[PDB]
Design a protein around this nucleic acid. Sequence first.
RNA 1: AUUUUACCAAUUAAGAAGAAUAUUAUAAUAAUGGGUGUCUUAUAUUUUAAAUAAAUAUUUAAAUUCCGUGUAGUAAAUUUAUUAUUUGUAUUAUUUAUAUAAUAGGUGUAUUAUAUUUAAAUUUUAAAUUUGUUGUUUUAUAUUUAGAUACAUAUUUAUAGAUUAAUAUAUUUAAAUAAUAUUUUAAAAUUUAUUGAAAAAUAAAUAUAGUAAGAUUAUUUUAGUAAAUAUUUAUUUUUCUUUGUA
RNA 2: CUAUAUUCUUUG
Lengths: 48, 168, 142, 139, 119, 153
Amino acid sequence: QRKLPKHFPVVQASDGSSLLREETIACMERERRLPHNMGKLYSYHRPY
Amino acid sequence: IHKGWRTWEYQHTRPDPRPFPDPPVNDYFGRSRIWNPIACKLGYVRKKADEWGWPNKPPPPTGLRHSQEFFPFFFERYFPDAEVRLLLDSVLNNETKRPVFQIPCSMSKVELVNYLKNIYGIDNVVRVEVRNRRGRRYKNEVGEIKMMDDYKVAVVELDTPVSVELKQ
Amino acid sequence: PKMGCEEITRKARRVQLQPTEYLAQHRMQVWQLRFKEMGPPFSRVWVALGGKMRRRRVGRQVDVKDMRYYWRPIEPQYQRLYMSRLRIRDHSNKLRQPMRLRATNADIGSGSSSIEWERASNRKYGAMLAPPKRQDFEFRVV
Amino acid sequence: FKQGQGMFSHQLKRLLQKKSIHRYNWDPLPMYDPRKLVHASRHMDVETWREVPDPHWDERSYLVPDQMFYNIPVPPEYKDAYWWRELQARRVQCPVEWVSHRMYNKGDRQRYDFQDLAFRKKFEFSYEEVVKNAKDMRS
Amino acid sequence: GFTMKYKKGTGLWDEDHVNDYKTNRYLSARATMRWYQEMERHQTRNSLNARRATQSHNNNRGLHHTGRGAFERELERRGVQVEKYPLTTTTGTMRVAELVILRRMELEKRAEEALAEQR
Amino acid sequence: LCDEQYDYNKTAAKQRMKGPKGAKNPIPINRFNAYDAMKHDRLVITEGALMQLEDELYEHKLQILPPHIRNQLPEYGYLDSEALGDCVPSLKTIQMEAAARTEEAESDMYKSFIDNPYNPWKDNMDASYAVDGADGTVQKFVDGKKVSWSMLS
RNA sequence: AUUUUACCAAUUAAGAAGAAUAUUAUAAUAAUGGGUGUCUUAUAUUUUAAAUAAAUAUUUAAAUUCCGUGUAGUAAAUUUAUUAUUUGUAUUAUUUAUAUAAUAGGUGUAUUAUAUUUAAAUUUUAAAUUUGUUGUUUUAUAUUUAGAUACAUAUUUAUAGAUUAAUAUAUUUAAAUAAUAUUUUAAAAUUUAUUGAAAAAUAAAUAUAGUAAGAUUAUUUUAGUAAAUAUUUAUUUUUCUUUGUA
RNA sequence: CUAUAUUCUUUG
Ligand SMILES: NC(=O)c1ccc[n+]([C@@H]2O[C@H](COP(=O)([O-])OP(=O)(O)OC[C@H]3O[C@@H](n4cnc5c(N)ncnc54)[C@H](O)[C@@H]3O)[C@@H](O)[C@H]2O)c1
Ligand SMILES: [Mg+2]
Ligand SMILES: [Mg+2]
Ligand SMILES: [Mg+2]
Ligand SMILES: [Mg+2]
């Protein structure tokens, strides 16, 4: 039986320690702002 | 109550207030965006998860919490976090006495000079000029409004003109 | 109410089951003081006495005075009109028969003789029409 | 000004909707300060002129709760002015409207404590406990 | 209000005296299993809750989970039968069933040979 | 057969009833019916079912008969009853034999008690009755002792 | 030749990830005020009070301003009880979208009446409202779509009261024991709780509207016009013929 | 309708 809803993200170490969860979340978030991979945008509204 | 309404025909559930509340989150990603001073539960609780384990671990003595050695202060003193980055177009093939840095907004003019002295060993800095520029906002191809982090533009005035050369 | 509506997507009210009227509501006692119904099944008069009485008795004559002491059937319009209020418990139940003025013993027992009341030992075989039980010699409501 | 087409007045309609931190600050007692009643009704030892640490003091003592101290020992005769913050400590620590759902359904009337407004779960068995408690009675 | 609590278990089987107004004409292969799940969990949920509530309530009143107090606690020490009518226990009511069954199986041996003797 | 259908909101009374309006005890879906008979062609009946049907419908069919006919039922041996013990007991289901042996087992705890169901009111025909005039009561007496119980409230 | 008279016509299958963790009811196990782009501080983060309520109740009697008001423990902690995102798209049912357009070069006439080709003939827009029954007023640009609730039925277990003001009385024939419903849209008003200025706005209700009104969804039909009319139903009451009476 | 009339009879 699940201890979190199926649609929740997995934010945790591989050990299961929640020690860093806020760093992990912060990282994921700054990453959703500006993904490092991101190729050329085809949008007319462009960061520069 | 000159005349009582018929209230017996309603099951008990609270109707939504017609001047409905808008959601508390801030949707405006523009220039004029306001930081919300109001503090919810979640802020303090996430603090409490961040600093010590609040759900599980027992809280440390207050004397520790309020001291320089307490982990978020300890780790900040001995493991600092700043992205102090340089606009290359200032230091590219032109000789320029004034390179231009992007800086986290929580740094002072003094802290930048300390940064450049002790890390990068840049020992001649006449002074620093500081702008606060709101982070770069862009839409992607689905139309998702995104905003890169806010930054501080520091024009850093040196003694010796500095260039970084590009081999063509 | 459509899958687009801003009206219904924000919840307002929820309407409940509405309570029914008193089953006997329409047998009003102003009829039950005045008249009484007499009859064999399928023909029944409502009968009343006459008012000319309590204003001027004297001087008129004895015959026209004691034409007042007889039970008489009410006019049929009025009987239909008063009976109509007793017929509104079941419309479209054609096989039924209207409620009477005074509740008969079947009509008292019908409310305790169901298979929903059979465990209720209160109100069984009529209760509220009997005189009350002698209370414990130390009984007091305080 | 909140009425405009501007974005400052657009934020203020939204940002002002979130709910502030709530703690129950239960009222101060400026004129009866329980923490100074430790020095009440104590015999003096006259050599040192300090108080005599009477072992009978600490069983007659009445523990007055508060927020920024744990509990404060007070002599019993003086306990009667503190009757309200005994009722604020035993109270649930919110507006009762937030926790009101404990009240309305039936299962939560029987399982929760309502004495002087402390909504707190009573002791309640798990299912395996219930099964093995009903099984060894052979019922 | 009065929902007829006393008729809840009165029914011969597990599925009756239950207001079942959520239903269909044709029940599929697994809707039927769903029905047989719903009914027995309707009995089991309502029985186990009524066990838990009273065991917990009896525990909060400081007596035994049965509702059996100190006095009746003393009577069982001294070997005194504590109640008037000692109804059959769980093990007993299982034993009856199995003895009945173990009669019927033997009989269904004997009948087999009887009929094969005739036929 | 079917259990009688009870309505505990027959008037309006309980308002937070979601429900339908009507019988609160509808026939469950696994019973026999006209619909599922008309849908499925072969009707496969086990003999246990036959026996149970006959068993539950026996008294029903007996009551329907005209009274000059029901009088001949005992004469013809239709009505011989195991309880009275004129015959040897009949074949019952597993569960009913279980219950029956349960009562065979538990019939011994009611012997020395005056509330014994298997011999109630054994004291009628030695009994005396006395009418009290100070307050209307009729009290039972046996050997000058008051046997009868005044009710509590 | 410079030139083939003027006039006269529709009604379209839809090319495609441009409709699903979709809408509504349904789960009697959680629940201190959900707020992400968050993040010292609380002198400044207090909501409590015996009443009808986020707690919502199994009959027709009696009695009471005579005329709107009414049923009491069902079992004593017993199983009507405020449930909920997956260990079945949770199950069962229920509802569902106006992006998108080659269509045809002429059948009736050619001095004025208006579809049926032999020419003519014949034609006042419907609804509601009016009861001196209209000459008056209101609604309708068109296409498509939304739009309003009196149970036309009772197969064996089975049984049915009249009467008095009252106490009483007792010559004396039936019976398929169930109730839950009752058009529709509208005032000027009222009442409650907030905000603002020196009654107004905001938020809640289903007030009432046959002399204010307007709508009310399915043709080819099978008995007439207190008193009338309408629904269901009843009587073979005498003559030479005839007659809808109840 | 409410009061005064309280036997078969009587008021406003
Ligand atoms: N209206 C009534 O009072 C009423 C109604 C129906 C039945 N009864 C029966 O009247 C009798 C006494 O009534 P009461 O109200 O005067 O007393 P009660 O029934 O209120 O209390 C009787 C006490 O004796 C117990 N008891 C009852 N039956 C028992 C039994 N069969 N064996 C052992 N203990 C028993 C009761 O549980 C209780 O402990 C009982 O049979 C009761 O069930 C009374
Ligand atoms: Mg709960
Ligand atoms: Mg499409
Ligand atoms: Mg118009
Ligand atoms: Mg339509």
